[PDB]
Amino acid sequence: SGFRKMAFPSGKVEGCMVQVTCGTTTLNGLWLDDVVYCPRHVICTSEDMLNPNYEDLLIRKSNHNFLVQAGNVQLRVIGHSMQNCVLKLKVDTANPKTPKYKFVRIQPGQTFSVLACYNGSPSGVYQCAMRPNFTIKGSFLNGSCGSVGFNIDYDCVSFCYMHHMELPTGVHAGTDLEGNFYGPFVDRQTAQAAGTDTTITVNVLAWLYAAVINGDRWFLNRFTTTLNDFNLVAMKYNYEPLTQDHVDILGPLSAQTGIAVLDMCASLKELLQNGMNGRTILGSALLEDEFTPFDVVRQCSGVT
Amino acid sequence: SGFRKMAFPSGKVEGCMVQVTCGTTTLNGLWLDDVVYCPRHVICTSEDMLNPNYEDLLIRKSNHNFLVQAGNVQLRVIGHSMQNCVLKLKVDTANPKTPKYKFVRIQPGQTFSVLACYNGSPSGVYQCAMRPNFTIKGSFLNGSCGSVGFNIDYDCVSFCYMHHMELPTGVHAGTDLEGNFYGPFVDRQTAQAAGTDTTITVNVLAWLYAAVINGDRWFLNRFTTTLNDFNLVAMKYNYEPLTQDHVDILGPLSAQTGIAVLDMCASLKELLQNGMNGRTILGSALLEDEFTPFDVVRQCSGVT
Ligand SMILES: C[C@@H]1[C@@H](O)CCCN1Cc1ccccc1
Ligand SMILES: C[C@@H]1[C@@H](O)CCCN1Cc1ccccc1
Incomplete structure (x- = not known):
């Protein structure tokens, strides 16, 4: 647990x-x-x-x-x-x-580990998400550029991120390993403003499933909703829209917990509308969006 | 940043x-x-x-x-x-x-990395604190026992923790590498209740310093306090007492930021008394206690 x-x-x-x-x-x-x-x-x-x-x-x-x-x-x-x-x-x-390795260009909302380095020497490792505005919220001092973001599939490292810039707002921009920037950013010390920092809805729902699995269930309510109704509320709260693809991806967590995806959506809706009322979920006072459905299954099943 | x-x-x-x-x-x-x-x-x-x-x-x-x-x-x-x-x-x-390695028995409130493993194979790494009640709040499934907690000083791994048990309350207990349990726990499937899960006060203050350094300053107030006055409030809120040793340890962060430790204590006091009023500090809606003063200096100075 x-x-x-x-x-x-x-x-x-x-x-x-x-x-x-x-x-x-x-x-x-x-x-x-x-x-x-x-x-x-x-x-x-x-x-x-x-x-x-x-x-x-x-x-x-x-x-x-x-x-x-x-x-x-x-x-x-x-x-x-x-x-x-x-x-x-x-x-x-x-x-x-x-x-064994690949170069992969990830999508916004996908998660990866960063090995923060200085002078070619590792200082630490942390888990990130690519934000919907294609920034990341890293920990990077001068000399950290060229630090990389990766996923591991058993023995194969998929490199997805190389660190290049700190925007004037202290958020981070970089490239895939083909050197193409995530988002509209350029390697120039100029006015570069990130778009709306929205929440990765599908990841929040994954993490709500992780909470139920680990015994945190206080937020489960008696309600359901529809994708359109849920999405109206998501939009109001700067949450990315939930697609049928996201619902399908949450299927196994739905199956394991016996909580339909739209019921979990209704639970999330009430958390958005009513806040946490000073309570916590998996030791967090806000809704965590840096675990994918894949991450929740991986960690809850103990993949190596 | x-x-x-x-x-x-x-x-x-x-x-x-x-x-x-x-x-x-x-x-x-x-x-x-x-x-x-x-x-x-x-x-x-x-x-x-x-x-x-x-x-x-x-x-x-x-x-x-x-x-x-x-x-x-x-x-x-x-x-x-x-x-x-x-x-x-x-x-x-x-x-x-x-x-190069040592075996070290850490104190409560000290932080370390856990390499979570299954069948001798690493699955992930995360950063922990030893809770004041000598539990840790890990992520450990069956087969994870013998997973270890460590610190690295340049090239020397200090091993401090080996994972042994999940208490009935889903918190974790283990030993140092001499096999002595942290806390009053035993390797038996019995009634073992952890004591009060209190907050590591010195770590919260470290992390408040980390916030100021990284531009999050909304919580800085016009007040100071005394150790005794602050400790009365800490006690009410299940915060561990702050000692002169903790104040001395925070000295360099005090120096770097020009915020006296007792002023930061007065800021923390008001956060305890008044809560976050829906605001965040370094992307957290609660007061983080799993960074030591040493951790804040390390990460803010980029030690490898
Ligand atoms: C433009 C943003 C950006 O973060 C990434 C892509 C989609 N977003 C749209 C959005 C805006 C406001 C509320 C909800 C959703
Ligand atoms: C017994 C606990 C335990 O977590 C570790 C050691 C000290 N604690 C004392 C404590 C209790 C209540 C409020 C503040 C402090």
Whole structure:
């Protein structure tokens, strides 16, 4: 019993973290096979960062300008190219600790673990969701850029996120491992305002199921609702719409608990309308939205 | 910027997790050098668990009854002894992945990462506090026993916790790595009631400092208080007393923020007396007590 905000074990990713230095800028790189992936803004002075021209900045750069360090051993860079907003540094050594891996572009509301690193060294791991506005609410100081977000399926690391920016509002933006930004963000120190930070409705319902499974049931009410009725209320409260796809995804939790998805929706509706009245659910005083249905099943079934 | 419930990177501990099987019971063991540490209740049938006599159960056991598996390779057990509530299985192979390590018995209110495992395989990592009543609020299903709690100081893993029991109230009890229970608990399926689950006051204040550092300041008030006055209020609200030692420990956060510890105490007092009035602090609707002063400094300074 018990439900925790649980990150994937980080060992397989720890083994891929290196230090990349271009001139006076040091940040983190991901070493997979004989390629080190890092944010292209490694080539910028924070002066550059106001209106950087990456193609022009890169003309001045050679393989030997990219200093790549894995522990206390230097990697020889034998090529470099820019793909979108990441640099791919070809090194002469395949990472011997390369796990089975994929690059995946996640959807908003999907969850992943971040291994926060500084100078190619892991400092901690935490579990995130991609917000519906394609930001994440991370913990990232200067030097953390190139820290990555991942999921693990048994022995396969799916890399979904590389950290690039802190918006002026202290929320975080980055790319998939093809270097394409999540959301409308760019690697420039400019006016970038995130959209509405809405709640991931399907995740809240998953977590309400997790609560019922773990014995927290005070919020279960006598009511049901419809998708349209529930969605009217969701909208008022800056909750993302619930689709039939979300209902289908919650099916197994519905099955396990014997609480129909629309009944759990009616319970959530009353929590929105009436608040918690000072009570807690799984030790939280607000409605948690950083567990997917998949996460709740995984943790409630003990997948390794 | 940003503040997250961050676990230590788990790789060094992942490399120490094995599967221990005695008869039909499988749980997790910790392989350090040529010793595998596991809960002694591995020798019990859940029948035994009502009033087990470990010394008598162990007489019937031989080295070859303890099946130890590290990945898909079997370890040869060449000795076994009971130390308090843990078994030490001597194997013929030193774990080649043994990190530098210590065994430490933590105090209540201290924080640590748990690597939740099943059949010697990591499933996730989360950050805990030892509650003042010496329970932890974990996420542990059957097969998770022998999962461990640790801190990392640069390259040295300090192991502080091994998971043994779920109390009938769904909270968790375990031992240090010398096999001595935290709190008054025993490895028996009996009436064991935890004491008052109080809040770790010093940790709340640390986390209020973390909030100020990260821009959440709405709760800062115009008031100060005294230790005695604050402690009267703490007591009423099931908060542990604040000592001069706690004030001294908060000194660096006091210094960094320019908010005297007793002023932050007056802010906490008003939060206790008046509640959050529906507001949040670092995305929480309650007062978080699972960050130590050390944790706040570590994460706010980016230690690896
Ligand atoms: C624009 C936002 C954004 O966060 C992501 C995409 C959808 N959202 C729409 C939305 C707005 C207000 C209430 C509910 C839903
Ligand atoms: C007995 C508890 C226990 O949780 C740990 C040790 C100290 N506590 C005392 C306490 C009780 C009530 C309010 C405040 C403090």
